[PDB]
Design a protein around this ligand. Structure first.
Ligand SMILES: Nc1ncnc2c1ncn2[C@@H]1O[C@H](COP(=O)(O)OP(=O)(O)OP(=O)(O)O)[C@@H](O)[C@H]1O
Ligand SMILES: [Ca+2]
Ligand SMILES: [Ca+2]
Ligand SMILES: [Ca+2]
Lengths: 123, 360
């Protein structure tokens, strides 16, 4: 994978968020982090530095209640690809709207938000 | 414009990456003269003067000349493309023999001159189509059933189980029990008629015995079926007995474990720490999983097999007849896929064995 966003991923501690947009992986502007279109699917990478200083990766794909099949499929595959790209070191988590894990919910300090709509299907 | 071809034992599904459904779905049959060739519905029509053959048995190619005819028809007659112009995604069984993967690759580049190709495991494509990276797929088609545990994007080959009990078997079985009922299917169109009764009227009983009783003591479960000639026959307990045989292979004289148990058995072959996510992501896939009641019955049977506190989820998308195809469409559409392909250039460099390194 030469995907430019791959070159960026998991470089330093932090949270990085991408949205699936027509079969591509597209970064989310940092000032919109936490506001999720329930019509869309997203890939979230959480990079944590341990006491060691060692980099740890948790990779969450979040599926909007109304995201289309191509969107949730792509988010799942992109996740596998990114994990592979990070030498299989990412732990992968499927995050469904309305049922996200506490760890994921914890990533957004002012609480995540849902909003209707999104990018049209790639199909 | 990549193409996606999903070769099954009974049916070939084919289309264009980026479409939400296969454009072409036709029988995986090649007909040659008893005393030139034909594929699909045409072969089936002219079957009185042809020897008809299935190039794929139990999901595995057993006849390459005839497989070539299937692909030639797929490209030229069904999709109407010149294959030299398109990357092609093909699908395979999870445990597809090494030599078969090579031969596919070779045929694609040498016979059809594909500029690019890739081979994907069918079960994995269904998982991806359900928007999961981890789960267990129960894939039941015309010629074979498999339970295929997948973790974080990749199948666990050691954990995979194969059940040689599928649609064709269910169709034969329906023919037997309708005959036993007193009916007689004697025309050339017997198998198609009984296959159609299966697909239109069969369902899986939540409680098999209780259904047997309901059926024996009332007429409520009975359905009318109009034959090609206009004769109307009644389908009673055969509706749920036919697919019961997925759960009870003894109905067919097989010592086999049923689909629920096979699924459990696969999960149990996997590292303890992933089983929770397998039980909670049991994806049904293939034509033979289209029986109404199947998911509920799976859920019930896995529930009875697993600890009581285990969360069991059966996922049975309405479009699971084409799950595999749809996962290929999606996969082959990704911006990231142009780097996954085996290119012509790579093929001329390493030959068919390139597939073992590029595709998995
Ligand atoms: N609605 C239905 N209910 C029950 N069975 C169905 C239904 N629709 C199709 N089938 C059966 O599904 C089988 C075809 O499914 P599919 O195309 O998944 O198989 P395949 O891929 O050709 O077979 P395999 O996967 O075994 O190689 C046929 O036996 C067909 O009769
Ligand atoms: Ca969307
Ligand atoms: Ca990993
Ligand atoms: Ca199949």
């Amino acid at each position: 994978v030469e995907h430019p966003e791959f070159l960026k991923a998991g470089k330093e501690p932090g949270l990085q968020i991408w949205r699936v947009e027509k079969f591509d992986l597209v970064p989310v502007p940092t000032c919109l982090y936490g506001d999720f279109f329930t019509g869309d699917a997203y890939v979230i990478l959480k990079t944590v530095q341990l006491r060691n200083g060692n980099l740890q990766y948790d990779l969450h794909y979040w599926l909007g209640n109304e995201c289309s099949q191509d969107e949730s499929g792509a988010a799942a595959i992109f996740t596998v690809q990114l994990d592979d790209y990070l030498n299989g070191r990412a732990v992968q988590h499927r995050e469904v709207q309305g049922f996200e894990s506490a760890t994921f919910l914890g990533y957004f300090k002012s609480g995540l938000k849902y909003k209707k709509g999104g990018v049209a299907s790639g199909f | 414009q990549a193409l996606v071809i999903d070769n099954g034992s009974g049916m070939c599904k084919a289309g264009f990456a980026g479409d939400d459904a296969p454009r072409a779905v036709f029988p995986s049959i090649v007909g040659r003269p008893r005393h030139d060739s034909y594929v699909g519905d045409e072969a089936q029509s002219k079957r009185g003067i042809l020897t008809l053959k299935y190039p794929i048995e139990h999901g595995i190619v057993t006849n390459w000349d005839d497989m070539e005819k299937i692909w030639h028809h797929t490209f030229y007659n069904e999709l109407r493309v010149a294959p030299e112009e398109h990357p092609v995604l093909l699908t395979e069984a999870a445990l597809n023999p090494k030599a078969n993967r090579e031969k596919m690759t070779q045929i694609m580049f040498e016979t059809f001159n594909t500029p690019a190709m890739y081979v994907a495991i069918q079960a994995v494509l269904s998982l991806y189509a359900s928007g999961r990276t981890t789960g267990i797929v129960m894939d039941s088609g015309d010629g074979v059933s498999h339970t295929v545990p997948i973790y974080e994007g990749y199948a666990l080959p050691h954990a995979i189980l194969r059940l040689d009990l599928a649609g064709r078997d269910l169709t034969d079985y329906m023919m037997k029990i309708l005959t036993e009922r007193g009916y007689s299917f004697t025309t050339t169109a017997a198998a198609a008629i009984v296959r159609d009764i299966k697909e239109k009227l069969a369902y899986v009983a939540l409680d098999f015995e209780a259904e047997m009783q309901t059926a024996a003591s009332s007429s409520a479960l009975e359905k009318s079926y109009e034959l090609p000639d206009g004769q109307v026959i009644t389908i009673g307990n055969e509706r749920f007995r036919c697919p019961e045989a997925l759960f009870q292979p003894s109905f067919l004289g097989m010592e086999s474990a049923g689909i629920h148990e096979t699924t459990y058995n696969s999960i149990m072959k996997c590292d303890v720490d992933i089983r929770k996510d397998l039980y909670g992501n049991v994806v049904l896939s293939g034509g033979t999983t289209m029986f109404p009641g199947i998911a509920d019955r799976m859920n019930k049977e896995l529930t009875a097999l697993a600890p009581s506190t285990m969360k069991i989820k059966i996922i049975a998308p309405p479009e699971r007849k084409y799950s595999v195809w749809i996962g290929g469409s999606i996969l082959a559409s990704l911006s990231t896929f142009q780097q996954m392909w085996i290119s012509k250039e790579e093929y001329d460099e390493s030959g068919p064995s390139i597939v073992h390194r590029k595709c998995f």
